[PDB]
Curated annotation (Swiss-Prot):
Residues 1-51 form the Chromo domain. The chain holds residues 85 to 267 of 373 of the full protein. Mg(2+) binds at E148. Disruption phenotype: Plants show a reduced level of the major light-harvesting chlorophyll a/b-binding proteins (LHCPs). The lineage of its organism: Eukaryota, Viridiplantae, Streptophyta, Embryophyta, Tracheophyta. Component of the chloroplast signal recognition particle pathway. Required for post-translational targeting of proteins into the thylakoid membrane but seems to be dispensable for co-translational targeting with a translating ribosome present. May be able to function independently of cpFTSY and FFC/cpSRP54 in targeting LHCPs to the thylakoids. Acts as a highly specific chaperone for LHCPs, preventing aggregation and being able to dissolve aggregates. This is Signal recognition particle 43 kDa protein, chloroplastic. Homodimer. Component of the cpSRP complex, composed of a FFC/cpSRP54 monomer and a CAO/cpSRP43 dimer. Interacts (via chromo domains 2 and 3) with ALB3 (via C-terminus), but not with ALB3L1/ALB4. Can interact simultaneously with ALB3 and FFC/cpSRP54. Interacts with LHCP and LTD. Expressed in leaves. Detected in roots. The binding to LHCP occurs through the first ankyrin repeat and the L18 domain of LHCP. ANK repeats lie at residues 52-74, 75-104, 109-138, 158-183. Unlike eukaryotic or prokaryotic signal recognition particle (SRP), the chloroplast SRP from higher plants lacks an SRP-RNA component. It targets both chloroplast-encoded and nucleus-encoded substrates to the thylakoid membrane, post-translationally for the nucleus-encoded proteins and co-translationally for the chloroplast-encoded proteins.
Length: 183
């Protein structure tokens, strides 16, 4: 008896709830995602995930009016993780300013936005997350901080062509930022 979904929120640990405009006229109220049709939920969430994967700052800003900054997908990713991995410091800052949990861990290894930024070699995003107050000591399921992950990826990166050489330079910048080195 859903007319439309008119809002989203996180609940508890890792759950989503939706604000429902009811067909029969009862005042809108919050229900767990499981109480209503999967297709109506999926169709409501789509523009959010599209905006995050496009690092579309304008669309994220508009959608935030009614939706939770920390909406999670099936794998426990929030928009912050998607835009951090893509290297969008503009969208990282937008979402942080909107109240995103900077320390959110996913369910595909327990990675944070800082692990995504370190692993995809996004030094400006690592800088931004540190500035904005991410807890750099948060560990993934393997017990690795973002700094330890960056060092691991550096050790597995060969030195053989100019693109690989450049990747190593970016990883070294990630490492220097997380170590708190003087620039
Ligand atoms: Mg350690």
């Amino acid at each position: 008896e859903v007319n439309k979904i008119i809002g989203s929120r996180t609940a508890g640990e890792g759950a989503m709830e939706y604000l429902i405009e009811w067909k029969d006229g009862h005042s809108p109220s919050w229900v767990p995602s499981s109480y209503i049709a999967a297709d109506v939920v999926s169709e409501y969430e789509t523009p959010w995930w599209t905006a995050a994967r496009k690092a579309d700052e304008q669309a994220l800003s508009q959608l935030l009016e009614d939706r939770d900054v920390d909406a999670v997908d099936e794998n426990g990713r929030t928009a912050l993780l998607f835009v951090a991995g893509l290297g969008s410091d503009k969208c990282v800052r937008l979402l942080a300013e909107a109240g995103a949990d900077l320390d959110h861990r996913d369910m595909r290894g327990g990675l944070t936005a800082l692990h995504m930024a370190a692993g995809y070699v996004r030094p400006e995003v690592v800088e931004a997350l540190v500035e904005l107050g991410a807890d750099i000591e948060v560990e993934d399921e393997r017990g690795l901080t973002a700094l330890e992950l960056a060092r691991e990826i550096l050790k597995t990166t060969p030195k053989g062509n100019p693109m690989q050489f450049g990747r190593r330079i970016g990883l070294e910048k990630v490492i220097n930022v997380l170590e708190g080195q003087v620039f």
